[PDB]
Design a protein around this ligand. Structure first.
Ligand SMILES: [Cl-]
Ligand SMILES: [Cl-]
Ligand SMILES: [Cl-]
Lengths: 203, 203, 203, 203, 203, 204
């Protein structure tokens, strides 16, 4: 389907959890979301995960120019991809809400489509206490109508490291998508009209 | 069913465990209880869990005025939602029974519906000794006629952290409801007849 | 069946393990055993577990006078229910054998029905060596004709905390009953005539 | 089946592992072997396990005189049952072989039936290194024609504590019996073909 | 099935994860790749793993001269096989990518087929933090058109040591092959069509 | 089939993993390999495991003279069974490869059937790092044509202690045999013709 038709499945302010595995080729959905987007794209890049998506798409033969043109907010890492507009540090595997808000202030083209890559990395690295703060990190932004956030997370990484943390994560978001071989399953949604349905937006 | 009928399933003094998961959208049931209750609402908000429920409902388009109008006793956390009448500290992942009673003594309109949110968070953070004190906290109030308590807990979070603790919790409460896709199961009840039955008060 | 016929399933000196879960509402079987008992009742109350049973029954509308009139030996705890004839301190999660006998001497008119509540708590809290001491505490009393003991234990609490202890426990007792939704399963018994059979004495 | 027939399944020098569970009432088999023995009986009583078996049989109504007349070597424990001809301390959850032999040197009527009770307790108490020493002790006696040893072990206790240890144990013994609800299964035997067969000697 | 058609499944710059187990005889596939590659072969030999593949093929009766003539970069280990053009010390279970780059600067006949052997050894040895740096090492080269890398990893070793790590690895590579008894499963590929298909190039 | 045919399933230089369990009575297969053998037999006895196999066979009624007259290289242990031609020290649950070669230097007959007993014990006793060294110890001798080694290992003991280690072990060997009640399964082999097949060599 058309890019903007897909976004119509969500409301401004939502936090969407996109669960995928290593065989899912999640970078394809990320490309679909960024390519020819009608709204401004802002990527929160955790631990150089955007660079990984980028290189995989580049090798696949995609035109990565669109990925290079979006604005990015790095949280750790040393490989800059896209228009970096901010660089936050990660202490105790969590960012500074103070610094983060000071960075988005330079944005004024709201609303924006906000993909967040690499959250599962932070979770794998920390203990229960630090994992809980990472989730608080996510729930702290749910509802801010400045954007629609898409948290791409490798489901298995989180499940196997700490199953309780995955459950907390699915609880605080408003919608949950799961990339499977036959398409994208809408596990949870604000619109009961689409809950449990499977869509194939890339067709 | 009627909201007046749903509440009839319980009697004053009961402690009801409401088990849910990340895909349950448990906030819908909380909203239902808050918006259809004819008694005063007193929420025990553990670690800003109420703010998360409120935020999810708000984004979902619900009129959340009823939520801001209830009385709230905060245990930890920093996000105020509703009329906060007390703030307790989470020392050793538990709360003082003395300081709590000191706060609830300022209430006169009894009985009340008392939703408790975030207990699983407390449990997830503590060890077995601390978890036991949390369970003891819950059993110490079972039977007090000034209210009917609804403990909303993310079942998976507790079961994966300490399965024994989840079973202790289920033992000490008088009723147990579990939210599923088909509806709400009454897993345990004072009424020996309803056990195992499923109801859909929100349809 | 009327309680006194239920008691005929056992022989004086027996130690009966009553296995239940949080959804069993085991307090119902306890009430049945205590109410109108023709044999004296002596309750060993571990860590205020008797108060929890009492409280759930009271809220359920039972006439709990019978529970307040039986003799009780408390092991730890601060909630007094019934005629407390003794208070024993808990050290390393077991009770002094000397102190216990020192207390049971002030008793006459044997045999007695001896409900023991809360053993699973001692196991959940103690270390592996203390868990073994708990089982040892239980086996020390098997065979004494002055009573028939009923150890009410939350099966899941023990098995999910330390499966080996449950096995040791089941081995030292003479009879094992398991409360299920369909009735009480007699998992083990001295009488090969009832082993594997299910009875419903509460009807 | 009669005593002599059952014993013909084994030859002198053999070490037989008798696996059971809490619900098996293994004391019935021990009674069968003791009461029906033309050979002298010598029991290795580890951590008062003989006393436990004794007590269960007594409460069951069995005539425990035959158990009181066997010679016993105690390893730890404080409950004396039978004619104690020796007492040994358990160092690091193992037994000194030089001290054990110094005790059995007083026996002048060979061969004997040697039941060994409570081995799973020594294992539940030790770590891998200490557990390996226990199996070592067991394999050092295999083959000695002065007796036929029957090691009664609670299978689940060992398996849950250390599965590798159970596998090693089964490897060093010459015969393995497992008590089930339908009868005793011969999991391993020097006699080919009877492996996998089930017998009911207590019928 | 084929010879030159095999390499056509991949594009220059790809990173191929080849998953196998102890019963796969994965060396057969390595032999095939080395012996049928028209491009230069450069092997990254981690902890003398090339020597193990080599000895196994030699014993199987294969002509291993082709294995001895490829260029090799040893990462740890003391068993030289092939033509060692560089050696790297292992520190914190990873190597200096900077020194590695210097070592490969001598290569001037690009592209090359780059088999990497023994990665699961570095993973089995390190902790989570170190395992992440190993995966990081792998993702850093994804897309470099100088070669096509085939990482031979014992799947069970990684999965059983750190399941989260296996999922991270599968995520960062562009293609994944899994050796099975029925043939090679293409679990992931830049070509949508072939994903899920099985090929038997060794026929 | 007699040993002669059985050994023909393998070729010199191979390392064969023989997986068994406590109910397998693996000693019977060992007896079959030793009793039956035109080639010289050399047993690597780790932590007195040979004594245990010997004792079980003895109580079973077998003639154990053939086991008493073979050459043995002890790796730890206290029970002397067979003709001990060497004693090796076990440090960090592994054996020095420089000392081993010195002990087999006295061996004039090649090739020899080399049953290695008790490896799972070294693994059960060590951590992951020491286990990996044990595996290296096995892979370092894969391919030496002076013998055909048969490592008798209690699979469950290794599997339950460290599943990864078992997979690593199965990887470095050239053939894998698994003893079951219906016979010996050939889980892996250099000879594709026999792979996956089940044989019952103990049948006369
Ligand atoms: Cl309904
Ligand atoms: Cl009945
Ligand atoms: Cl055959």
């Amino acid at each position: 389907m058309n890019s903007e038709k897909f976004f119509k499945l969500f409301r401004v302010g939502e936090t969407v959890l996109v669960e995928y595995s290593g065989t899912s080729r999640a970078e394809l959905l990320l490309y679909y979301i960024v390519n020819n987007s009608k709204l401004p794209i802002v990527v929160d890049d955790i631990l150089d995960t955007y660079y990984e998506f980028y290189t995989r798409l580049k090798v696949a033969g995609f035109d990565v120019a669109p990925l290079e043109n979006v604005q990015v907010i790095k949280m750790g890492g040393t490989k800059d991809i896209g228009r970096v507009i901010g660089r936050l540090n990660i202490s105790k595997y969590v960012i500074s809400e103070q610094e983060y808000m000071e960075i988005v202030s330079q944005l004024k083209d709201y609303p924006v489509i906000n993909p967040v890559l690499g959250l599962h990395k932070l979770i794998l690295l920390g203990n229960t206490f630090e994992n809980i703060n990472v989730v608080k990190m996510v729930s702290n932004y749910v509802g801010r109508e400045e954007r629609i956030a898409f948290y791409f997370v490798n489901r298995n990484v989180i499940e196997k490291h700490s199953s309780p943390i995955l459950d907390l994560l699915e609880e605080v978001v408003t919608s949950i998508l799961e990339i499977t071989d036959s398409g994208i399953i809408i596990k949870k949604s604000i619109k009961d009209e689409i809950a449990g349905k499977i869509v194939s937006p890339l067709l």
